[PDB]
Design a protein around this nucleic acid. Structure first.
Ligand SMILES: [Mg+2]
Ligand SMILES: [Mg+2]
Ligand SMILES: [Mg+2]
Ligand SMILES: [Mg+2]
Ligand SMILES: [Mg+2]
Ligand SMILES: [Mg+2]
Ligand SMILES: [Mg+2]
Ligand SMILES: [Mg+2]
Ligand SMILES: [Mg+2]
Ligand SMILES: [Mg+2]
Ligand SMILES: [Mg+2]
Ligand SMILES: [Mg+2]
Ligand SMILES: [Mg+2]
Ligand SMILES: [Mg+2]
Ligand SMILES: [Mg+2]
Ligand SMILES: [Mg+2]
Ligand SMILES: [Mg+2]
Ligand SMILES: [Mg+2]
Ligand SMILES: [Mg+2]
Ligand SMILES: [Mg+2]
Ligand SMILES: [Mg+2]
Ligand SMILES: [Mg+2]
Ligand SMILES: [Mg+2]
Ligand SMILES: [Mg+2]
Ligand SMILES: [Mg+2]
Ligand SMILES: [Mg+2]
Lengths: 214, 113, 121, 117, 54
RNA sequence: ACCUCGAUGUCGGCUCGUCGCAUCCUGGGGCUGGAGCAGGUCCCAAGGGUUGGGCUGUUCGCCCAUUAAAGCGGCACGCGAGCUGGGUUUAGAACGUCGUGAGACAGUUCGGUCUCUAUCCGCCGCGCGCGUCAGAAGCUUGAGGAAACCUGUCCCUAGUACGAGAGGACCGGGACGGACGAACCUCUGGUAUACCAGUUGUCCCACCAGGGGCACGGCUGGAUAGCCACGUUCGGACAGGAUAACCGCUGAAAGCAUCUAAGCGGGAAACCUCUUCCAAGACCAGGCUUCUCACCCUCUAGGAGGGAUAAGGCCCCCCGCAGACCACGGGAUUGAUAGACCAGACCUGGAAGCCUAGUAAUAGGUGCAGGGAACUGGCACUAACCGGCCGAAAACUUA
RNA sequence: AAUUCCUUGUCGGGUAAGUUCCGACCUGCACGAAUGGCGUAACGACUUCUCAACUGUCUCAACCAUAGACUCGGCGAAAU
RNA sequence: GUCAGGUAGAGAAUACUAAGGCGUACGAGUGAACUAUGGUUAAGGAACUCGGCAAAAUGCCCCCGUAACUUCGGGAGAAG
């Protein structure tokens, strides 16, 4: 029902449509994925399928994961993710050891990419939540970038947990919605996703079929 | 090596004549005017050429009706069908941005003899 | 990229030299105004003895901007002087002639008169 | 080489360049220098590039090396002794070692040397 | 700001106990015929004879 | 005048928000002296939005352009250990008045120091120790929480229904926008303190040439990489359940009637799922899997203590677009992790030398030349080391 | 109007918008002729308004280098 | 209070430098937010702000040419 596969953000580039219109696309490496485990409602309680992607040396593979892959009946990989399907009717379409490629998608389809946004370190409020800065002149005394007030004078007492303040941003799970897949290069196992996806170049990403437009 | 070259070569366009910033060129752009695709000629001087492979672009400046107009075009854009370099240019910079304040004789560009 | 309190050269034979934008129509709080956008401006300078005079409040379509404008085919267009053309009540260019060039973005809708009067693009 | 990507080694700008130049001069003059760890780390690429320029030195490279090193005797002895000595080495002419910290400020100290072999 | 009240001994010692040192990882090395303890960071320097050993 | 004169800093504006609906708009409904558009009144509804300027310290208020709107209030007439002081409310001086007078004027004008290294709680992020009943690892259900909810213009329906005419639809679809948020450098731009080219002053390399330090990188024209918006994409859903106002069906009490007394229904941007993220410290401390599942000594055998180990982890080492430290991620001789070298892409623009023309500056051939950093492909040339620490089960009852 | 509570008195000059700015009307709460009345070329780090350029004051914020802030080595206070 | 070089510069200002004196007394690292000192910016150019506050702009030598007013000196280095 809900197709999906793991890949790696290769980079970004441009393409041209049939009407000479420019389209900035993202080249992603939706390399081959191996089905290593299938979650069922009778065994675990939910309908999901476990996929594995990426090359790893058997010496670098850890012993627990090595034994897990041996019991599954496939070779080890770098990354292992899980896609939660809708029901056993959809889970039955997968089998342990099955190999999935970029051919599961078609041109013009709508996907959702999920990755880990880049890390911006300890960023201030103005960069975290777009806080409006203060005047840089007319007397401003060391408040050119400070947040300012925080709450009520003496009635609230506390600071109303949830106030937007400074801290470490980025490096969190982000998910885009309704990205148009421009082209699916089969010989190369590559996807041209219309737009920009989270994460840096060479980072792991999970592409799925869109929910609002699937 | 341009890792994405194996995807950019499919869109790379041939028959692109070799030009440099400062040469006079007239580009032919395919423009659709009310269900009618015609060819519009834009004659100017290449003031800059930013190379990025498939995303390589070039800017052409033209003085029309006493007003300057700068137009940037992707070298590998399919909307273009002809790029004729009329006369070469003898310049020293790579991006002739200083031409945004010269008019007439002061804006004339040398020619590679 | 035109906004409030921005001066624009009038391209028409109405007698106005430069106008000052007041507000960009087409939205609650619009920040900028590109090519093809309508705005409300006042005549800050006019030709001695022209139709319109200084201090009037009129409408004008923002054409021939200075900031780069990106088209649908990846190309860009930019001019060297922020210009504008005073329009009539609903949609019509005040005057009977245009002087400078206009961007192709004017062809969106209802600007056929200006597109035909402009001797370029 | 690659920028420091942060606060420079010696105070403000325009001083790290002279510091690296003096360090490379001392290295090419002696053969073994003892400095701070980050100083040697930043000098490694500088010294390697200077050694490559000396290797390639036929003409227009002597000036490229002199525009960074002032000691004429140091430049000459470099181009002469080192010269083709590393012609068989495809990079990596400098070796870095870590030594104990000095008294006062616990600055991690390193030692840069030239691979003789 | 200034401290409002005197911090109790409990909290004082609890916050002070965190200011401790970390012992370094030593490694046995055979130099000059005798075995000595030198950190792995300076193991190579001691092997080559650049680490002073009192 | 009930705490506060052995101190509670008083009106604005900027930043920052939280909450009530006596609702400005969006949403739903009843009556209309509702023909239609457009209105008047009432009820429910706070999820979201509620513009930019001129005057004036101003709150307030008037005016100019729009928009659906440019809501009313509480939070010490919110917020000065977040920010300025335009005014009030010190000391100086002036104008008009009172006062012989010093002096005074909720009458006016000019100018007039805004201190404090965060102790505790509170808030935004990050670690250490321990627990989840052997020691570890992979993937996740999830209670319980956080984030979003905005809407305009145009075309068809349809110039149709309505209406003498003027004027002009409800409902349902299609297209394009204004604001906000998330991601990113693919395009355009902002910055690039070890990049390129020109040059003024000055000193130096013995001197010409060619070069180096300082004068903001000395100044300009560019500038690969990282970050960013001015730039490029994505979202405000669809649908399901129960409802407020409201509209209802069968129906007596009370032979009629009645939306209710027993049931069945529809019913909104309100509520719960649905969308994005966190989350088993959720002490009911979870679930599916995989690795090791066995070695000694002491106390006087009841448990405990000490040492050495398996899987695994950590330290040390090379690094990152991960980062204040930490922590996370990748590698560690069975390797392309980083530096160097080669090549490519890209930036800069035609390098030094020689020769030629010119008395000279200077120009032309060797030459897409020379120089370079972040991007990419190879190459062990250099450092990831003949190395150290933690780290596995008391038992019992029922079925 | 440095003088006026009514006052943002009324008209006109400028801005699309002007309780500010300039001239006039004169109803002088409570101007007035050596505690000077009326102006004055030049002048003033005095006060107020406008115009041309200019720019990050702002729309709308973004990056670069330093001295602190952050880690390490040593010395080492404070107000309460 | 006295000596006062050289290079360009009107200049004892400004930049470097000769002779001369010093790196002066806590240091090594790390692109955190934020604070202070400087630089840069696509479009608008005071629309921010009580207030052009701060920032930004011209800036020197030789020439052409300089208004209203005036106490005839001045405005004036007007301006351009
Ligand atoms: Mg400041
Ligand atoms: Mg307070
Ligand atoms: Mg190029
Ligand atoms: Mg310097
Ligand atoms: Mg007290
Ligand atoms: Mg007190
Ligand atoms: Mg209500
Ligand atoms: Mg809701
Ligand atoms: Mg304002
Ligand atoms: Mg409020
Ligand atoms: Mg208050
Ligand atoms: Mg007084
Ligand atoms: Mg008296
Ligand atoms: Mg503080
Ligand atoms: Mg004004
Ligand atoms: Mg007056
Ligand atoms: Mg008097
Ligand atoms: Mg007097
Ligand atoms: Mg004086
Ligand atoms: Mg310390
Ligand atoms: Mg910093
Ligand atoms: Mg600017
Ligand atoms: Mg500009
Ligand atoms: Mg103003
Ligand atoms: Mg100033
Ligand atoms: Mg200045």
């Amino acid at each position: 029902a809900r197709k999906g596969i793991l890949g790696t953000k290769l980079g970004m580039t441009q393409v041209f449509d049939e009407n000479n219109k420019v389209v900035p696309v993202t080249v992603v490496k939706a390399g081959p994925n191996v089905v290593t485990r299938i979650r069922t409602t009778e065994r675990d309680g939910y309908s999901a399928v476990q996929l594995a992607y990426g090359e790893i040396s058997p010496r670098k593979v850890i012993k627990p994961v090595a034994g897990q892959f041996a019991a599954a009946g496939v070779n080890p990989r770098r990354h292992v993710a899980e896609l939660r399907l809708d029901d056993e009717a959809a889970v039955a379409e997968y089998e342990v050891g099955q190999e999935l490629t970029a051919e599961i998608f078609s041109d013009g389809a709508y996907v959702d990419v999920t990755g880990t946004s880049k890390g911006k370190g300890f960023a201030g409020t103005m960069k975290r939540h777009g806080f409006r800065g203060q005047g840089a002149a007319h007397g401003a005394q060391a408040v050119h970038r400070r947040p300012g007030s925080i709450g009520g004078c003496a009635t609230p007492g506390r600071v109303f947990k949830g106030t937007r303040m400074s801290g470490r941003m980025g490096n969190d799970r982000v998910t885009t919605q309704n990205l148009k897949v421009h082209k699916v290069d089969a010989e190369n196992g590559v996807l041209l996703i219309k737009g920009a996806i989270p994460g840096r170049n060479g980072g792991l990403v999970v592409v799925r079929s869109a929910i609002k437009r699937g | 090596m341009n890792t994405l070259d194996f995807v950019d070569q499919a869109s790379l366009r041939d028959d692109i004549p070799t030009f440099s910033p400062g040469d006079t060129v007239n580009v032919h752009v395919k423009v659709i005017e009310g269900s009618k695709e015609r060819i519009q000629v834009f004659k100017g001087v290449v003031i800059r050429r930013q190379g990025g492979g498939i995303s390589e672009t070039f800017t052409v400046r033209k003085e029309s009706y006493g007003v300057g107009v700068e137009r940037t075009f992707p070298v590998h854009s399919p909307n273009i069908d002809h790029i004729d370099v009329l006369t070469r240019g003898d310049v020293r910079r790579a991006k002739l941005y200083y031409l945004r304040e010269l008019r007439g004789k002061k804006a004339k560009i040398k020619e590679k003899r | 990229m035109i906004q409030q309190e921005s001066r624009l050269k009038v391209a028409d034979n109405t007698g106005a030299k430069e106008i000052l934008c007041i507000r960009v129509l087409g939205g609650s709080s619009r920040r900028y105004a590109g090519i093809g956008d309508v705005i409300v401006a006042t005549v800050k300078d006019a030709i001695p003895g022209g139709n319109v005079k200084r201090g009037d409040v009129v409408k004008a379509v923002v054409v021939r901007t200075v900031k780069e404008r990106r088209r649908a085919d990846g190309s860009y267009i930019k001019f060297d002087e922020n210009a504008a053309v005073i329009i009539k009540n609903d949609n019509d260019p005040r005057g009977t002639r245009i002087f400078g060039p206009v961007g192709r973005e004017l062809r969106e809708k209802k600007f056929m008169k200006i597109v035909s009067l402009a001797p370029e693009v | 080489p690659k920028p420091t990507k942060g606060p420079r080694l010696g105070g403000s700008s325009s001083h790290q360049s002279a510091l690296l130049a003096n360090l490379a001069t001392s290295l090419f003059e002696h053969g073994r220098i003892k400095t701070t760890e980050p100083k040697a780390r930043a000098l490694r690429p500088y010294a390697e590039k200077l050694i490559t320029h000396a290797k390639k030195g036929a003409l227009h490279n002597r000036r490229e090396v002199m525009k960074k090193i002032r000691d004429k005797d140091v430049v000459h002895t470099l181009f002469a002794e080192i010269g083709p000595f590393y012609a068989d080495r495809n990079g990596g002419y400098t070796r870095i070692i870590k030594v104990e910290n000095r008294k006062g400020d616990n600055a991690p100290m390193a030692v840069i040397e030239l691979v003789r072999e | 700001a200034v401290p409002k009240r005197r911090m109790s001994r409990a909290n004082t010692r609890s916050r002070r106990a965190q200011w401790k040192a970390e012992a370094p990882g030593l490694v046995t090395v055979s130099v000059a015929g005798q075995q000595r303890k030198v950190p792995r960071r300076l193991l190579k320097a001691a092997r080559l004879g650049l680490v002073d050993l009192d």
